[PDB]
Amino acid sequence: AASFREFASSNSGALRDAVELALNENGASLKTLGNS
Amino acid sequence: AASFREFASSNSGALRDAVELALNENGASLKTLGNS
Amino acid sequence: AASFREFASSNSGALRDAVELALNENGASLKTLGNS
Amino acid sequence: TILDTSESVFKNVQGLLESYGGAINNLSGQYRVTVEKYSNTPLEINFLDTYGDLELSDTTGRNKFNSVQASIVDPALSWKTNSITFYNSNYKEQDKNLDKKLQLSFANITNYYTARSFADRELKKSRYSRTLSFSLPYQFIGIEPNDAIAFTYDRYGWDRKYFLVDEVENSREGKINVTLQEYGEDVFINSGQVDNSGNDIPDISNNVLPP
Amino acid sequence: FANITNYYTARSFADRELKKSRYSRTLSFSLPYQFIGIEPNDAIAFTYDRYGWDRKYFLVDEVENSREGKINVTLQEYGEDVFINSGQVDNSGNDIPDISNNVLPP
Amino acid sequence: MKQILDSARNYLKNNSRIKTASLISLELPGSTGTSTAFIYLTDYFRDVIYNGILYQAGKVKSISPHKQNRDLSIGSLSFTITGTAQDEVLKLVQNGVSFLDRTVSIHQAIITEDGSILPVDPDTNGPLLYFRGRITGGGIKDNISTSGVGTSTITWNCSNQFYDFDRVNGRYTDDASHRGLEVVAGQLLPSNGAKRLEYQEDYGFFHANKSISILAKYQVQEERYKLKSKKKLFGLSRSYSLKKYYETVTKEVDIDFNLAAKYIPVVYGVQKIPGIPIFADTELHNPNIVYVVYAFAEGEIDGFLDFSFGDNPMICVDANDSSARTCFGTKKIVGDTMQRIASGISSSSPSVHGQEYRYNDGNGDIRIWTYHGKSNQTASDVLVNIARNRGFYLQNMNGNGPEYWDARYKLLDTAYAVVRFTINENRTEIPEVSAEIQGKKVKVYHSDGRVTANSTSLNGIWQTLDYLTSDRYGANITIDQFPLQQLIQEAAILDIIDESYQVSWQPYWRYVGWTNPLAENRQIVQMN
Amino acid sequence: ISILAKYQVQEERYKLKSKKKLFGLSRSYSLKKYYETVTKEVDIDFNLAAKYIPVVYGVQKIPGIPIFADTELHNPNIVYVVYAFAEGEIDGFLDFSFGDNPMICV
Question: Where is each Tip attachment protein J domain found (chain D) (predicted)?
Fold first, then answer.
């Protein structure tokens, strides 16, 4: 697990991309948090 | 890294599930973004 | 894929950490959802 | 329906569909709309038709309810709001007396009796929590959301167990993945009701009584 | 503060929060089963010579039990001084009466 | 910490190979009647007996870890049982099943070399508990390979009592909700939905919805549907932006298109709150005489202290208010209270159940009856002696009889005030009404085993305990799950005396909540 | 509109009633935040969205968007105003409310 924590924290941007892909598909985005 | 980008983008839905599990555990959800 | 679903759901917290790292870097956080 | 055209079209459509449970599809390329239904002649299927991968999941705790209130705008209240609510004794007995209230608001419905009859649908539906997922070979091509499946599988004791198709994924090879949502027949049947005419409150204001 | 109205109490509590905020350190490790029965907000004194820590004081902040018995924990540092207030001074000189919606008599 | 018996601590310290059994007591799903079976299971390699209850062996496969931290959470678990046991599949897949609540408990037993269970918990002198809670869901996974072995497994998912953080469990002023109406055979009836059986009698709130539409005809266009908000400063946290917080702090609401306003608030300590109107009418012969009923607060409150009409309080704030305006007594040093208006002398006491108070503003009579909302309160006798005479105007215009108001309008468990306005040239409209009250009585415990249950408490623990164990509202947690001998130590912490200040610096003290300015009123924490 | 304001009490001089007050609730919303965002009125000053034309199906009640105001030259007591209401060919107007007072008796 800990290795996966270290890896994921080292690769965080790609996860954010994938999440934005899903939410864009439904029609939403994290940027609402940026403004909020 | 790039392989991990490609993989994650190909498997985006499972990440969204895991995030929803954590946030539901604390008592929150992304659907607030859907309405917002 | 299914193995990756099972793994990610078993390791959900680390993904949430990585997302918070990215969003904190830009200056945002999921806790806005907690209050919202 | 009243639509504010400043809302983005996607969201206006979504709320409009949500008002009557419809959903739309573009599998097979034509735009198609499929309301939920109780169907007399569902497509029969058996476990052995599938690839054999099967998963059942049930989410009673959040999703289930046993009493409800709904809110509407009503001309008999001068287009003020009205708040329908009711309980279900049998459901509260099947649950261990735990009270749990469903909250609703209907944007586009104003006939009180229609709103009540629809809320009863939503309450009854909420008892049927089960969702099921599996994969099908290419010969079953042409399935869509809100098709009616009867599922038969002896080991579980299921026998023409009734489901609606809720998600679909086509592939270049032809293998089809599906997910089913359980419903009963009784979802689509309303009780009796009673004449509500005794409370047509006239919300007069901004007037001065004559001498 | 939503639920506190005694000014002096509110001040004495805010002083706590300020003092607490100086103690940022958090620490994580795992324990064998014999230490069973720990809970959040138990008080730990930690001793480890290489760091120079000597009855270094912590509160338990997260716990995870397991079927095997292995316990993971996390500690949050605090000092003693967190729980002690200074003096204060009588604030009675500003009891502003917010009268409104009234008409002076002749 | 829970203190284990030290024999166990020593045994565990010595012995290097240990045997442990997990023992599951489980309520059966889908008892359609309230009576339910239980099943008992273990993961141990053979069946085991405890309290003479025999726990079966072999069905269990695994149990998840279990995490908690300083934040509130559902504390969820899962555990798994073999998918091949035909009975358990049938236990899921029956159609008529419900398990929205079913209980589960998981004991953890050290088993010694003679096969006895080691004593560990000094309360029961027995095995520990690993977990306890309620079922929330489950699932089945069947994997068939084309070739070689497949697998089948059943998962059960469990959680604490907060497993639906969406649950709203208040009360709000609508008869069908309060009585618990359901439709049968072409009429409405009271049924099980009432939060308590007695409520089915209570035709309270029956007039409520129309009453506001009547009341508007007596108010300036500023107010005709407005209401003041409740709990204006909700707690700030780093989740909020400073701006968005203070910009969402809001003083007022419109009841038109707003239902949340009509939920009854709960109060502990001393607070100021607006009245929810639930009935308005005029005396038939003299439309200048107006009766109004305001509901205020859940439960038995310690009592009303004061009323504000608009923002004008009856009691003078200080000497300057007394100079500006007619008012009785003073809040500021003496802590006078509305009891003074009936006694003619200074008093700190709250109201008494059912007295008539005559606030002579010098602008025609205001009269008040106050009911503290205690159970077994009757309907108000002044209203009854009108409706029984058909004295109400709208009563006579609709043609209703005494059914319009009688001994069935009890308004149980609900504090309410009857206001009799007089309208004249010097009071051309009804003002807004809000009041200051001393809150709900709570069951403070004592280490000696008493339960005083007499008064409000400013202590946050006893406040939380009442809110949790309340079932009419709140979380509906049974008291037997709490360790009283622990909680009392926590209160003995939280009531430590502070000395950073002295009581004489606080003139307000009676409104602050202290019952006496001289007895120590100082504790690290006081909550309203 | 800047002309029309000279004929209205300070209560109203730029206010307008909202459209589609009850937008659809879903589990995405908190109950509170929903009913607290349900809003009766808007100010056209600094608000452009108010001036989008709504679409209607069935029967509904809606506020008029003013697009022209003027007075007869010889007799300033005579005021013409044009209100736009709805997109497309409607089946027709049924009734008017001036303030909340409808012409037809309730």
Answer: 67-158
Please enumerate in sequence order all residues whose Cβ is within 8 A of that of F518, keeping only pairs 6 or more positions apart, or say none: F503
- The DSSP bridge pattern shows strands F128-143 and D54-58 to be antiparallel
Contact of G40 with chain F, judged by CB distance below 8 Å, is answered with yes
Judge: B17–C9 Cβ closer than 8 Å, yes or no: yes
Residue A15 makes CB contacts below 8 A (sequence gap 6+) with: A8, B8, B15, C15, C18, C19, C22
CB nearest to A11's CB, from B4, B12, B33: B4
Q: How far apart are the first and last CA of chain G?
A: 31
3-state secondary structure of F476: coil
Contact between F378 and F420 (Cβ < 8 Å)? no
Cα–Cα distance between F390 and A35 in angstroms, integer? 61
Cα(G6)–Cα(F131) distance, integer angstroms: 72
Residue pair F295/D119 in contact by the 8 Å Cβ criterion: no
In sequence order, the β-bridge partners of residue F156 are: F79, F138
- Between strands D54-58 and G41-43, the pairing is unpaired
Q: Which residues pair with D165 in a beta bridge?
A: D180
Task: Return the number of other C-beta atoms located less than 10 Å from residue G14's C-beta.
Answer: 16
Confirm if F289 and F421 have CB atoms less than 8 A apart: yes
DSSP3 helix / strand / coil % (chain F, rounded to 5)? 20, 30, 50
C-beta of residue D36 within 8 angstroms of C-beta of residue D146: yes
F-chain CB neighbours of C31 within 8 Å are: 237-239
**Residues of chain F neighbouring B26 (CB-CB closer than 8 A):** 71, 73
Reading the block at residue F359, the tokens are 């606030």
Sign, CA torsion F470/F475/F477/F479: negative
Å from G31 to nearest chain D CA? 8
Q: Where are the alpha helices (DSSP H) in chain B?
A: 2-10, 12-26, 31-35
D3: how many CB neighbours lie within 10 A of its CB? 21
Cβ of F161: how many Cβ atoms within 10 Å? 17
Long-range (24+ apart) CB contacts under 8 A made by G94-103 are G94/G59, G97/G61, G99/D206, G100/D78, G100/D203, G100/D204, G100/D205, G100/D206, G101/D206, G101/D207
Contact A14, C23 (CB under 8 A): no
Phi, psi of G40 (to 5 degrees): -85, -30
Spatial strand order in the sheet of F301-309: F270-274, F433-440, F301-309, F312-313
By CB atoms closer than 10 A (0-12, 13-18, 19+), residue D4 is: middle
- Touching F (3+ Cβ pairs <8 A), the chains are B, C, D, E, G
Instruction: Judge whether G32 is closer than 8 Å to chain F, CB to CB.
Output: yes
Distances (CA, A) of F484 to F406, F430, F449, F487: 44, 49, 9, 5
Chain G residues lying within 8 Å of B34, measured CB to CB: 28
Touch between F and C (at least 3 CB pairs under 8 Å) = yes
* The pairing of beta strand D80-87 with beta strand D67-74: antiparallel
Q: What is the 3-state secondary structure (H, E, C) of F380-433?
A: CHHHHHHHCCCCEHHHHHHCCCHHHCCCCCCCCCEEEEEEEEECECCECCCCCE
Query: For the purposes of burial, counting CB atoms within 10 Å of the CB of F10, is it exposed (0-12), middle (13-18) or buried (19 or more)?
Result: exposed
Token couple for F17: 């190979």
Using a CB-CB distance cutoff of 8 angstroms, which residues of chain D are in contact with residue G52? 4-6
